[PDB]
């Protein structure tokens, strides 16, 4: 970070695979970079490096990840377009320009081997070269830093894509083109100001959709139609305006990750225990009063986040869960700790989060056993 140039001793290793050069002016890529052949990741932050023919030939076959964070258009080296075996790319910097839009990325076409492309470049609209390179992509990440992103039938043409992330694209409403991507398996739309997500009724067109991410939005209510997505295992809808949970949502018995923290929840439906594969529960910062009995049906509940909740008493069924690996209780108005929590074989002191002045309320035998299990 912030050196005069490339030291010549850094070529002393063969165990290197990630190189990160940031704010290091006028670094010329020597042929001596051949001293490390297994290197596959390279970070060039705020530095357009000058390259040599042996170095370019070496990089044309033995590089996989290139990170380009640029304060200027000229800070992007041109020669990076010549590489053929690249598979991970990252372009950070506001390349959006008037009447020369997405022209700095014209050499992206030759990256046939590419599978991963991440974009944090304040792109107001979807670039055409992105559509060109989406014929064979496996992961596309777009981050506009809250800028409104417009597609208008330009994202459905990436049939081979397997992961889609449109973070802070300010869509405010799901575009239909995403439903055309039948190969798409996991979708992330974090912080896009979503208020009505009934478009999930089209999600049945995705037969391998097992994870959905629509968190950090203004979603008021969860449509019951999400019960049609039985495949889902991880569902993320926390940081929203949800006060009630539809019962039909609990038709997806495959659900394993259910995080709904920072919401207006007050009751946990009796159907929450219908999901045997439920492994992670997170309702932190809510108004939950008590744990429903069915919530203990999931014996493999390996995570439990109950913090900042108004629970009055801890149910005694918690000891019936033996796969409990971690649970946080800090921030709750509990009179005393039930001893059943102490009978979990997988539980540890570090796994448990609770106030010491109440943690001492447990009998000394249970506390000593917990400390011993924490030690080794």
């Amino acid at each position: 970070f912030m050196l005069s140039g490339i030291p010549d001793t850094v070529f002393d290793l063969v165990e290197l695979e990630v190189l990160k050069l940031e704010l290091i002016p006028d670094v010329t890529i020597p042929p001596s970079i051949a001293q490390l052949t297994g290197l596959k990741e390279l970070w060039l932050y705020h530095t357009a490096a000058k390259i040599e023919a042996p170095a370019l030939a070496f990089l044309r076959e033995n590089l996989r990840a290139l990170h380009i964070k640029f304060t200027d258009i000229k800070e992007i080296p041109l020669w990076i377009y010549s590489l053929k075996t690249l598979e991970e790319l990252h372009l950070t910097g506001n390349l959006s320009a008037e009447n020369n839009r997405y022209i700095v990325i014209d050499g992206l076409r030759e990256l046939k081997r590419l599978k991963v492309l991440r974009l944090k470049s304040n792109l107001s609209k979807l670039p055409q070269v992105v559509t060109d390179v989406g014929v064979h992509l496996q992961k596309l990440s777009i981050n506009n830093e809250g800028t409104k992103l417009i597609v208008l039938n330009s994202l459905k043409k990436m049939v081979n894509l397997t992961e889609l992330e449109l973070i802070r694209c300010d869509l405010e409403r799901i575009p239909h083109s995403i439903f055309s991507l039948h190969n798409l398996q996991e979708i992330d739309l974090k912080d896009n100001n979503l208020k009505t997500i009934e478009e999930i009724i089209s999600f049945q067109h995705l037969h391998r959709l097992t994870c959905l991410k629509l968190w950090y939005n203004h979603i008021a209510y969860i449509p019951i139609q999400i019960g049609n997505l039985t495949n889902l295992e991880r569902l993320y809808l926390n940081r929203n305006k949800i006060e009630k949970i539809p019962t039909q949502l609990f038709y997806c018995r495959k659900l394993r990750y259910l995080d709904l923290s920072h919401n207006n929840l007050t009751f946990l439906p009796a159907d929450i225990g219908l999901l045997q594969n439920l492994q992670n529960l997170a309702v932190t910062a809510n108004r939950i009063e008590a744990l429903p009995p069915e919530l203990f049906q999931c014996r493999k509940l390996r995570a439990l986040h109950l913090g900042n909740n108004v629970l009055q008493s801890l149910p005694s069924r918690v000891g019936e869960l033996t796969n409990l690996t971690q649970i946080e209780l800090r921030g709750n108005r509990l009179e005393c700790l039930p001893v059943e929590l102490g009978e979990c074989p997988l539980l540890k002191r570090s796994g448990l989060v609770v106030e010491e002045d109440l943690f001492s309320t447990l009998p000394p035998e249970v506390k000593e056993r917990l400390w011993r299990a924490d030690k080794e």
Partner: nanobody
Amino acid sequence: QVQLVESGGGLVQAGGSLRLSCAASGFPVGRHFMYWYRQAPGKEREWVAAIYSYGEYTEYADSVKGRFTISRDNAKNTVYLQMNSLKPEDTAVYYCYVYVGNEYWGQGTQVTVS
């Protein structure tokens, strides 16, 4: 005041067509997503079709996709569901469903296939 009423149910032969009309009063049908579900005896209620609020995008149950047709007329604030190529496997009572602040299930119409 949000009221969903179903009309057009009854008995119909296999391979025929039937019109199920869902009428709404309290809310406009132009800006609201509408849903049609069905329930058969010995089986929990099953979703059939859904219609959007923008773009006239319509989805249907894969078992009956292409067999039924859902449309809406905003002037009468109604949803028309035309069922074609009927078979005994879809003998069920069909309900109109919406969520406007709260859930709303319609009266429903039982269609039997002979």
